[PDB]
Amino acid sequence: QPQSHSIEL
Amino acid sequence: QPQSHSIEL
Amino acid sequence: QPQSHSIEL
Amino acid sequence: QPQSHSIEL
Amino acid sequence: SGRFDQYPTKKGDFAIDGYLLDYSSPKQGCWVDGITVYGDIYIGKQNWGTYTRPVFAYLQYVETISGSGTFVIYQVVLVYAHNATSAGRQNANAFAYSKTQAVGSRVDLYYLSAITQRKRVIVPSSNAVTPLDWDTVQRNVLMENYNPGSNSGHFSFDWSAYNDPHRRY
Amino acid sequence: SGRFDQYPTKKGDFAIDGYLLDYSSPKQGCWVDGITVYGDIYIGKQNWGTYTRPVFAYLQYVETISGSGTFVIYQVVLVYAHNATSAGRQNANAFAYSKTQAVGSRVDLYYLSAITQRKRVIVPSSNAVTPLDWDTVQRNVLMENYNPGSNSGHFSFDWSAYNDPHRRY
Amino acid sequence: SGRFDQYPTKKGDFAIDGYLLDYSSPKQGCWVDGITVYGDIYIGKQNWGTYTRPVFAYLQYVETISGSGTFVIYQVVLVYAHNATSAGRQNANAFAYSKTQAVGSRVDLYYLSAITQRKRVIVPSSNAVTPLDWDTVQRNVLMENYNPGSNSGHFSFDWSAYNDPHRRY
Amino acid sequence: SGRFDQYPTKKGDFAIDGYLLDYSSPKQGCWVDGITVYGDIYIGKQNWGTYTRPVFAYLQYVETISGSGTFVIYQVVLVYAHNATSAGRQNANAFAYSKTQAVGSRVDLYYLSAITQRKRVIVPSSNAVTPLDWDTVQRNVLMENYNPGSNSGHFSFDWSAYNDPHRRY
């Protein structure tokens, strides 16, 4: 499963 | 008047 | 004689 | 050891 | 346009490039006062004795360079006008924007061609302009601002090119 | 060599390209009859009011492609002559081939610049010619065939450019 | 296509270029086995932690060089596949060809990007091929030959990129 | 200098570009972990079965634009290492920086080649770095950090390329 650090703003 | 040497074939 | 507008420094 | 197919001249 | 009539006239390579490729305020276009030449140009099935002269020049979007901040690259497109003598009978529908003119039984073909020049300008996206498109250029330069019947408008061809060996090829 | 004097004179973009980029027989070079313009050109530490005009054009080697058979691609290098007014005091040694001319206390800088054109021609190696080099071109065009003292030789500048808004930038 | 399935797989810059930029028989395209990387890519209003890997490469028409005879110039277009993590909620309609995949509440955005490489090939018009278009490439590579739900098809992403500092930026 | 050893290692196109083409802090160079391929490369008078792999990548000066303010444009130069098998007997002096290695009677030629990438970044002069030169890169990468005798140093070739059809061309 792909890991993420992305923050939605 | 424009001069021409063109030959239609 | 060539005319100029050039300004040195 | 590196393999070759190169032919000189 | 309106806007097309307001565009100034430039003469000489460096004057055209100097006016358009301005980093402070890049310009959409300018009319070009240029030399008429004569020689063979291939259209359709054969070569035609064609008169050629520059008539207009406009800025064209190349690419965007990102970083700090966003920058836009522009190129000069040099627009030429042609009179391909006797080509009108066989190539009347060869180009989207063209005009025909009779000289006796002979039918001349009037059209425009564009040549992208090498010189480029890098301008910040804040000083960026909306470039003109090839369709609008052809419509304003050839269709709206040139009459083959009277060889007049925003430009005219110099037919003496036929008799100058320097302007023949 | 004195082969430079044998080169013909051409006027207009398509006449210059038409003569040089000939696939059947490519030509080394030709002299160019062109318009003189006036505007700022940056040399050394600042901008100078410079007069610019095309003077010569020559073929340049692009590439040599493999086959079945050996083909040679040529390009046109357009040579311009400049008079950068007042630039001669601080930029007398800025270029390998240059000349200085006094106008009162003022020192003008006479030099040549080259611009590579986009148009290219594919020629078979059997019809290929030996291209001229930039060093030889500068020596023959500026050094041997132009006198700033009398504004004469194989070409001369049109100083009226300073008073024509069409030829100013 | 049909034709797309028949295309071989290449690995490494020179192998991709070597196969496609063949002067004897230029090839339409090839699948690419490449490394997956991880870093920020800007889509819509912000940056997203994106996984990137090359997936396909195809020939693109540049220009025609005339003379003796007619020659065609080709370029390699390198196609990359992306998983812009969390971008699917805000940018589901940002691209014409895209797919979304849920990872809990998070919506991942799967799309393709194309980068034109510098290397070119000059081929005679007799050996010329019909190049693939960007629309057909996106439809076959992403839409028809990749399943985000199972991370499988004609390629798959290596999620370990997130933990390799060499493959992070 | 020993600054070359301090440079990190990057793997994958976007990781190499992402690290180097950083607008906030552009980087001089990075070592590249890449795939070894096998195919013909022309050196001197003929083609040689050559092993090729990327080894290093560095920033190159493109241009410096005027303003309001002084901006600097950078590009990525991708450095490849080659083993042109049997080429060392006739091309030992073909390159300024090269090494020879005997495999029986056969003499292999070890050299470096550089390919300029398309991607560019605009950086303000305050954040600008001193780019590495091609002479220094070749000296550090090939001469000082690679031993053909043991196929070791800061990188090594994968000879299995010869047996992988995906890595052959």
DSSP-assigned letters across all residues of F89-158: TT-TTSSSSEEEEEETTEEEEEEEEEEEEEEEEEEETTT---PPPHHHHHIIIIIITEETTTTEES----
CA distance E66 to chain F (A): 26
| Residue showing tokens 């650090």 | A5
| Residue showing tokens 């990137």 | G52
Q: Which two tokens stand for residue F152?
A: 């004469």
> CB–CB of E37/E58 below 8 Å?
no
- Beta-carbon separation of H52 and G19 below 8 A: no
Contacts of E125 in chain H (CB under 8 A): none
Q: Which two tokens stand for residue E122?
A: 């890098």
Q: Which two tokens stand for residue G121?
A: 């090939």
Closest CA to H66 of E131, E130, C8, F42: F42
Closest CA to G116 of H73, H119, H115, E75: H119
User: CA torsion sign, E6 to E55 to F38 to E130?
Assistant: positive
Residue F169 has its nearest CB partner, among E9, E14, E165, at E14
Q: Which two tokens stand for residue G83?
A: 């998983």
CA distance F121 to chain G (A): 6
Q: Which two tokens stand for residue H162?
A: 């010869």
Q: Is H39 on the interface with D (CB under 8 A)?
A: no
Closest CA to G19 of G64, G76, G72: G76
Q: Which two tokens stand for residue H90?
A: 């006739």
> CB–CB of G109/G102 below 8 Å?
no
Q: Give the CA radius of gyration of chain G.
A: 17
Q: How far is CA E69 from the centre of its chain?
A: 33
Q: Give the CA radius of gyration of chain H.
A: 17
User: What is the CB neighbour count within 10 angstroms for residue E57?
Assistant: 26
Rounded to the nearest 5°, which phi and psi values hold at E140? -80, -45
Q: Which two tokens stand for residue H156?
A: 């090594």
> CB–CB of F50/F82 below 8 Å?
yes
Closest CA to H20 of H33, H2, H8, H6: H8
Q: Which two tokens stand for residue E51?
A: 């008169």
Whole-angstrom distance, CA of residue E106 vs CA of residue E93: 16
DSSP β-ladder status, H106-124 and F29-32 = unpaired
> CB–CB of G23/G127 below 8 Å?
yes
Tell me which DSSP letter residue E168 carries: B
Q: Which two tokens stand for residue E137?
A: 């250029």
Give the helix, strand, coil percentages of chain F, each rounded to 5: 20, 45, 35
Whole-angstrom distance, CA of residue G134 vs CA of residue G115: 11
DSSP H or E run through G145: none
Whole-angstrom distance, CA of residue G88 vs CA of residue G77: 26
Contacts of C5 in chain F (CB under 8 A): 49, 85
- Beta-carbon separation of H122 and E65 below 8 A: yes
Rounded to the nearest 5°, which phi and psi values hold at F41? -130, 130
How big is chain F, counted in residues? 169
- The CB-based long-range contact list for H6-11 (8 Å cut-off, 24+ gap) reads H7/H31, H8/G165, H8/G166, H9/G166, H9/H33, H10/G166, H10/G167, H10/G169, H10/H57, H11/G35, H11/G37, H11/G164, H11/G166, H11/G167
Closest CA to H83 of H33, H1, H146: H146
β-partners of residue H116 are H77
Whole-angstrom distance, CA of residue G151 vs CA of residue H143: 43
The resolution in Å comes to 2.7
β-partners of residue H112 are H81
Contacts of G66 in chain F (CB under 8 A): 23, 121-122
Chain H residue nearest residue D5, CA to CA = H49
Whole-angstrom distance, CA of residue E128 vs CA of residue E131: 9
Closest CA to F167 of C3, E18, E35: E18
Q: Which two tokens stand for residue E50?
A: 């064609």
Q: Which two tokens stand for residue E141?
A: 């330069």
DSSP β-ladder status, E98-103 and E46-65 = unpaired
**Burial zone of F68 (CB within 10 Å; 0-12 exposed, 13-18 middle, 19+ buried):** exposed
Whole-angstrom distance, CA of residue F69 vs CA of residue F67: 4
Dihedral angle, C-alpha F151, F155, F159, F161, nearest 10 °: -170
To 5 degrees, how large is the angle CA E55–CA E57–CA E58? 145
3-state secondary structure F92-103: CCCCCCEEEEEE
Three-class SS of residue G20?
Answer: helix
CA distance E135 to chain H (A): 30
Whole-angstrom distance, CA of residue E121 vs CA of residue H33: 36
> CB–CB of C1/F159 below 8 Å?
yes
Rounded to the nearest 5°, which phi and psi values hold at F109? -110, 115
Rounded to the nearest 5°, which phi and psi values hold at E145? -120, 30
Phi-psi region of H71 (alpha: psi -120 to 50; beta: other; left: phi over 0): beta
Contacts of A3 in chain G (CB under 8 A): 85, 159, 162-163
